[PDB]
Scaffold this active site. Structure first.
Site, PDB file in Angstrom:
ATOM      1  CG  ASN A  98       0.975  11.214   7.257  1.00  0.00           C
ATOM      2  OD1 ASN A  98       1.271  10.093   6.851  1.00  0.00           O
ATOM      3  ND2 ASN A  98       1.873  12.116   7.546  1.00  0.00           N
TER       4      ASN A  98
ATOM      5  CB  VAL B 204       1.452   0.356   4.847  1.00  0.00           C
ATOM      6  CG1 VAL B 204       0.000  -0.065   5.113  1.00  0.00           C
ATOM      7  CG2 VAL B 204       1.956   1.261   5.961  1.00  0.00           C
TER       8      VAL B 204
ATOM      9  CG  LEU C   3      -1.960  -1.233   1.294  1.00  0.00           C
ATOM     10  CD1 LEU C   3      -2.723  -1.234   2.615  1.00  0.00           C
ATOM     11  CD2 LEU C   3      -2.899  -1.291   0.102  1.00  0.00           C
ATOM     12  N   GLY C   4       2.042   1.145   0.549  1.00  0.00           N
ATOM     13  CA  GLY C   4       3.029   2.212   0.644  1.00  0.00           C
ATOM     14  C   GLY C   4       4.340   1.626   1.121  1.00  0.00           C
ATOM     15  CB  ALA C   5       7.255   0.532   0.211  1.00  0.00           C
ATOM     16  N   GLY C   6       8.735   2.837   1.952  1.00  0.00           N
ATOM     17  CA  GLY C   6       9.833   3.782   2.098  1.00  0.00           C
ATOM     18  C   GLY C   6      11.145   3.040   2.143  1.00  0.00           C
ATOM     19  CB  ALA C   7      14.591   4.146   2.970  1.00  0.00           C
ATOM     20  CG  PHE C   8      15.071   2.534   6.819  1.00  0.00           C
ATOM     21  CD1 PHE C   8      16.167   1.745   6.466  1.00  0.00           C
ATOM     22  CD2 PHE C   8      15.239   3.910   6.880  1.00  0.00           C
ATOM     23  CE1 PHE C   8      17.411   2.318   6.185  1.00  0.00           C
ATOM     24  CE2 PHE C   8      16.471   4.489   6.577  1.00  0.00           C
ATOM     25  CZ  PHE C   8      17.558   3.687   6.250  1.00  0.00           C
TER      26      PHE C   8
ATOM     27  CE  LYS D  54       3.847   2.842   9.734  1.00  0.00           C
ATOM     28  NZ  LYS D  54       4.579   3.898  10.470  1.00  0.00           N
TER      29      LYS D  54
ATOM     30  CG  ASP E 223       4.598  14.185   8.204  1.00  0.00           C
ATOM     31  OD1 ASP E 223       4.298  15.230   7.563  1.00  0.00           O
ATOM     32  OD2 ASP E 223       5.190  13.206   7.682  1.00  0.00           O
TER      33      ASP E 223
HETATM   34  C1  LIG Z   1       5.345   7.165  14.060  1.00  0.00           C
HETATM   35  C2  LIG Z   1       5.628   6.999  15.333  1.00  0.00           C
HETATM   36  C3  LIG Z   1       4.500   7.290  16.270  1.00  0.00           C
HETATM   37  O1  LIG Z   1       4.611   7.180  17.501  1.00  0.00           O
HETATM   38  N1  LIG Z   1       3.360   7.679  15.690  1.00  0.00           N
HETATM   39  C4  LIG Z   1       2.110   8.018  16.353  1.00  0.00           C
HETATM   40  C5  LIG Z   1       0.965   7.592  15.468  1.00  0.00           C
HETATM   41  C6  LIG Z   1      -0.274   8.229  15.508  1.00  0.00           C
HETATM   42  C7  LIG Z   1      -1.326   7.830  14.687  1.00  0.00           C
HETATM   43  C8  LIG Z   1      -2.665   8.529  14.744  1.00  0.00           C
HETATM   44  C9  LIG Z   1      -1.113   6.770  13.808  1.00  0.00           C
HETATM   45  C10 LIG Z   1       0.120   6.119  13.748  1.00  0.00           C
HETATM   46  N2  LIG Z   1       0.414   5.031  12.882  1.00  0.00           N
HETATM   47  C11 LIG Z   1      -0.253   4.638  11.770  1.00  0.00           C
HETATM   48  O2  LIG Z   1      -1.331   5.120  11.419  1.00  0.00           O
HETATM   49  C12 LIG Z   1       0.436   3.541  10.978  1.00  0.00           C
HETATM   50  C13 LIG Z   1      -0.190   3.245   9.637  1.00  0.00           C
HETATM   51  N3  LIG Z   1      -0.283   4.303   8.811  1.00  0.00           N
HETATM   52  C14 LIG Z   1      -0.829   4.129   7.601  1.00  0.00           C
HETATM   53  C15 LIG Z   1      -1.298   2.911   7.173  1.00  0.00           C
HETATM   54  O3  LIG Z   1      -1.844   2.849   5.890  1.00  0.00           O
HETATM   55  C16 LIG Z   1      -3.115   2.303   5.697  1.00  0.00           C
HETATM   56  C17 LIG Z   1      -3.923   1.846   6.739  1.00  0.00           C
HETATM   57  C18 LIG Z   1      -5.169   1.326   6.415  1.00  0.00           C
HETATM   58  N4  LIG Z   1      -5.655   1.229   5.184  1.00  0.00           N
HETATM   59  C19 LIG Z   1      -4.873   1.690   4.142  1.00  0.00           C
HETATM   60  C20 LIG Z   1      -5.393   1.594   2.829  1.00  0.00           C
HETATM   61  C21 LIG Z   1      -4.634   2.041   1.770  1.00  0.00           C
HETATM   62  O4  LIG Z   1      -5.062   1.985   0.470  1.00  0.00           O
HETATM   63  C22 LIG Z   1      -6.357   1.433   0.227  1.00  0.00           C
HETATM   64  C23 LIG Z   1      -3.362   2.585   1.962  1.00  0.00           C
HETATM   65  C24 LIG Z   1      -2.836   2.682   3.219  1.00  0.00           C
HETATM   66  C25 LIG Z   1      -3.576   2.236   4.346  1.00  0.00           C
HETATM   67  C26 LIG Z   1      -1.192   1.813   8.019  1.00  0.00           C
HETATM   68  C27 LIG Z   1      -0.636   1.963   9.282  1.00  0.00           C
HETATM   69  O5  LIG Z   1      -0.497   0.940  10.182  1.00  0.00           O
HETATM   70  C28 LIG Z   1      -0.709  -0.402   9.716  1.00  0.00           C
HETATM   71  C29 LIG Z   1       1.148   6.537  14.581  1.00  0.00           C
END
Ligand SMILES: CCC(=O)NCc1cc(C)cc(NC(=O)Cc2ncc(Oc3ccnc4cc(OC)ccc34)cc2OC)c1
Length: 294
Positions: A160, A35, A27-32, A55, A155
């Site tokens: 996001n 998802v 669904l998404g990818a970076g260097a390290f 993730k 961010d």
């Molecule tokens: C960073 C360090 C820290 O302490 N942060 C605090 C913090 C605060 C909050 C509110 C959230 C987070 N973390 C996440 O939200 C992680 C995360 N982010 C996006 C993700 O992408 C998707 C999730 C679900 N569905 C999708 C669907 C899709 O295309 C259809 C495409 C993508 C998707 C999946 C996913 O976890 C698995 C973190």
């Protein structure tokens, strides 16, 4: 940062067997990190399979990224289940690398959804001002929740924010699962690659991240939303002249579809004095008023 996420607990009620996860498309990818879409079996009481978003880190990740993903899991676990935040369903901490399992959001990130629906927009499956006003309200509700839990996002942007069923927006954080090196929305600033156009002056010049710096970013998110996914400060590069203009009080004009009352919110979010910026709670209340008048 107000809380130390390394001192937060991990409730083993979240633990899921990784053998029960079948991995699909990225669904998404970076260097390290990445998802990935997956099917989780026996996550439901009836033992019906369900689509989740996982993730995880790439073998390219170092101990910094391994710690960052564990702190992220502890924050997501701590926050609990709110309607305008991605909801954690489980995690795999034993038997191998950390897997953070969340709900799958049908329509992906809000930025790409806005750009896709740009040409199919009507102010009054067509996207309308009613939807935009509901998305702005939901994001401030979600942000008001994170601020009450002493969390600074750092961010906040349309990229996001995720869109799911019944036009529900959910705050997320791709973080390491975003290719920031190739994303033109992240600029080279010292040793880091930061989203300068979404950052408060205090974050740029003093690396200060507060509740008020997150409100600044929300004002940039609003501009993105009512511009239907445009990049902030259009045609303006991030150079010496850009930093000078921001310090000198230059602020963007309203996006093309922003109600005058939303641009008022934007202007206050972008106040040079963090103490003169509204709280996310004041923003929720302000938008509530505007929605009721419609
Ligand atoms: C960073 C360090 C820290 O302490 N942060 C605090 C913090 C605060 C909050 C509110 C959230 C987070 N973390 C996440 O939200 C992680 C995360 N982010 C996006 C993700 O992408 C998707 C999730 C679900 N569905 C999708 C669907 C899709 O295309 C259809 C495409 C993508 C998707 C999946 C996913 O976890 C698995 C973190």
């Amino acid at each position: 940062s107000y809380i130390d996420p390394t001192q937060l607990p991990y409730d083993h009620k979240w633990e899921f067997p990784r053998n029960r996860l079948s991995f699909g498309k990225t669904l998404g990818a970076g260097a390290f990190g990445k998802v990935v879409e997956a099917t989780a079996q026996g996550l439901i009481k009836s033992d019906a399979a369900m689509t989740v978003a996982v993730k995880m880190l790439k073998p390219s990740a170092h101990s910094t990224e391994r710690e960052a993903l564990m702190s992220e899991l502890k924050v997501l676990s701590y926050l609990g289940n709110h309607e305008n935040i991605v909801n954690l369903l489980g995690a795999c901490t034993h038997g191998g690398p950390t897997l953070v399992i969340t709900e799958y959001c049908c329509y992906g990130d809000l930025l790409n959804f806005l750009r896709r629906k740009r040409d199919e927009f009507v102010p009054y499956d067509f996207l309308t001002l009613e939807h935009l006003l509901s998305f702005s309200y939901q994001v401030a509700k979600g942000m008001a929740f994170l601020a009450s839990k002493n969390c600074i996002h750092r961010d906040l942007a349309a990229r996001n924010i995720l869109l799911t069923h019944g036009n529900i927006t959910k705050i997320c954080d791709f973080g390491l699962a975003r290719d920031i090196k190739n994303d033109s929305n992240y600029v080279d600033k010292g040793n880091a690659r930061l989203p300068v156009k979404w950052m408060a002056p205090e974050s740029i010049f003093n690396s200060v991240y507060t509740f008020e710096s997150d409100v600044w970013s929300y004002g940039i998110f609003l501009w993105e939303l009512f511009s239907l996914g445009s990049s902030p400060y259009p045609g303006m590069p991030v150079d010496s002249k850009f930093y000078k203009m921001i310090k000198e009080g230059f602020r963007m004009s309203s996006p093309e579809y922003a109600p005058a009352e939303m641009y008022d919110i934007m202007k206050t979010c972008w106040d040079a004095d963090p103490d003169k910026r509204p709280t996310f709670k004041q923003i929720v209340q302000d938008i509530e008023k505007q929605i009721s008048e419609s």
